[PDB]
A paper describes a structure:
Cytochrome [name] enzymes (P450s) are a superfamily of monooxygenases that utilize a cysteine thiolate–ligated heme moiety to perform a wide range of demanding oxidative transformations. Within GPA biosynthesis, P450s function in a specific, stepwise manner to install the essential side-chain crosslinks in the core peptide in a process that typically requires one Oxy enzyme per crosslink to be installed. Given the apparent preference for the unusual heme orientation shown by [name] enzymes, we investigated the [name] homolog from kistamicin biosynthesis (OxyAkis), which is an atypical GPA. Structural and biochemical analysis of OxyAkis has shown that this [name] enzyme is highly prone to oxidation and can display an atypical heme orientation in different protein batches.
Thus, we sought to crystallize OxyAkis alone, and we were able to identify conditions in which the [name] would crystallize and diffract to high resolution (1.6 Å). With OxyAkis no longer in complex with the X-domain, we observed some changes to the flexible regions of the [name], noting that the loop connecting the F and G helices could no longer be resolved due to lack of clear density and suggesting that this loop is stabilized in the complex. Additional gaps in the structure of mobile sites surrounding the heme and active site were present, suggesting that these regions are disordered without the bound substrate, which is in keeping with results from many structurally characterized P450s. Despite these minor differences, the overall fold of OxyAkis remained largely identical to the structure previously solved in complex with the X-domain (RMSD = 0.47 Å). With the general fold essentially unchanged, we performed a detailed analysis of the active site of this [name], which revealed a mixed population of heme orientations as seen in the Fo–Fc difference map electron density at the substituent vinyl and methyl groups. Given that P450s from GPA biosynthesis are overrepresented in the structurally characterized P450s bearing the alternate heme conformation, we explored various ratios of the heme orientations that could model occupancies (2:1 ratio) of a flipped heme ligand in the structure of OxyAkis. However, even once the density of the methyl/vinyl groups was well-explained by a mixture of heme orientations; there was still evidence for additional density at the side of the heme immediately below the I-helix (β-position). Given that heme oxygenase chemistry exploits the hydroxylation of heme during its degradation, it is tempting to speculate that this density may represent hydroxylation of the heme (albeit, here the hydroxyl group would be located at a different position of the heme (β versus α position in the heme oxygenase reaction)).
Numbering used by the authors: 5 to 65, 76 to 162, 180 to 384
The structure:
């Protein structure tokens, strides 16, 4: 439901969604059947207010899925996996991620144009980086990726002999405290939803840079803009458009209005990142980005350090190795997935150079 929160015009907001945002950053939505009262959180500040509040849970209205947990059990599991995303860990991983990116751009430059960038480059790249971060053994990566019992069997086996990566760390440091199913669940979230979001950022972000050739070249002239460019790209794309509802556990005042106990709040990251026409233009020279593309609060994207590193490496290397890159069809013909709660993405991206 609430399909209006996902209406777009290519990468931008649809007029119907812009009109909704004019009703304020916090919109009360009583259901027509009188079964519940829902809320739309559409503004940057209000979305952060909701997501930072302790007075909401993620009740429904799979083991190892942090998004389906509330404190204290959410805290318990997240604290065990968080060290895998430390700065020290990303620094040690960076050169290997660079090499994986180079592997896939090697394949791309050798196949010669054209290429379907989503299936042939972005997808495999994201899945291979995920395998490296997780520490998947080499002989299991091909099958694990093809699959996008096996997971439980894989998790139990790697749990017996801890290796490298996040999965080895967790099992090595929290062997008895995490089960096979929970480990498998941590792996699945990384290999499934996470790759979907990352691959979409890679493909749609490449399209976004191609539609702004001045900045495509600027990122090549000044690769130090990579970190800034990533923040602007994830803000502009908002591939994770809307969040699971947050239900108020008690009466709480948000954005000047009282959200009653039991009412559900739907945060629109898309609206929060894009509704403000001031400072909405795509501009990678912006030194600081105002966005909630990775969420906020206790459920803030645990993989943001990896996503930010991988995307920086990918975009900077791409613009450098393919200065002549261009869409093989007019940009206006690219197909985007119709409105849905699923990750936002294009369906294919034919490129040549
Ligand atoms: C490297 C790949 C990624 C991995 C492994 C990853 C893993 C996660 C995990 C495990 C959570 C749940 C945290 C919790 O509930 O405590 C999470 C939350 C989130 N991730 Fe990431 N993520 C990754 C890349 C992204 C990307 C590319 C985006 C979009 C730009 C993204 C947008 C989010 C959002 C919006 C949430 C919060 C959902 C909510 O609060 O309801 N993630 N991510």
């Amino acid at each position: 439901e609430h399909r209006v929160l996902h209406l777009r015009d290519r990468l931008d907001l649809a007029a119907e969604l812009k009109l909704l945002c004019e009703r304020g950053p916090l919109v009360r939505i009583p259901l027509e059947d009188g079964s519940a009262v829902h809320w739309f959180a559409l503004g940057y500040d209000v979305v952060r207010e909701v997501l930072g509040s302790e007075k909401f849970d993620k009740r429904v209205i799979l083991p190892g899925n942090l998004l389906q947990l509330d404190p204290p059990e959410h805290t318990r599991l997240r604290r065990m996996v968080a060290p895998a995303y430390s700065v020290r860990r990303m620094q040690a991983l960076e050169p290997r991620v660079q090499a994986i990116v180079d592997d896939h751009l090697d394949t791309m430059a050798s196949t010669g144009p054209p290429v379907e960038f989503l299936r042939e480059v972005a997808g495999p790249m994201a899945a291979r980086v995920a395998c490296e971060f997780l520490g998947i053994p080499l002989d299991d990566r091909g099958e694990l990726i093809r699959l996008t019992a096996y997971m439980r069997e894989l998790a139990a086996r790697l749990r017996r002999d801890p290796g490298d990566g996040m999965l080895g760390m967790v099992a090595r440091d929290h062997g008895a405290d995490i089960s096979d199913e929970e480990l498998a669940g941590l792996c699945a979230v990384v290999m499934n939803s996470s790759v979907e979001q990352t691959e979409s950022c890679l493909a749609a972000g490449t399209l976004l840079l191609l539609e702004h050739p001045e900045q495509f070249a600027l990122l090549r002239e000044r690769p130090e803009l990579g970190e800034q460019a990533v923040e602007e790209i994830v803000r502009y794309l908002s591939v994770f458009e809307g969040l699971d509802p947050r239900t108020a556990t008690e009466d709480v005042e948000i954005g000047g209005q009282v959200i009653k106990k039991g009412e559900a709040v739907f945060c629109s990251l898309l609206a929060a990142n894009r509704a403000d026409p001031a400072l909405d233009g795509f501009d990678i020279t912006r030194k600081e980005s105002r966005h909630v593309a990775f969420g906020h609060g206790i459920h803030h994207c645990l993989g943001a350090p990896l996503a930010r590193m991988e995307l920086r490496i990918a975009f900077t290397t791409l613009v450098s190795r393919f200065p002549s890159l261009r869409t093989a069809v007019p940009a206006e013909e690219i197909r985007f997935r119709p409105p849905s709660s699923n990750v936002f993405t294009l369906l294919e991206l034919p490129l040549t150079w």
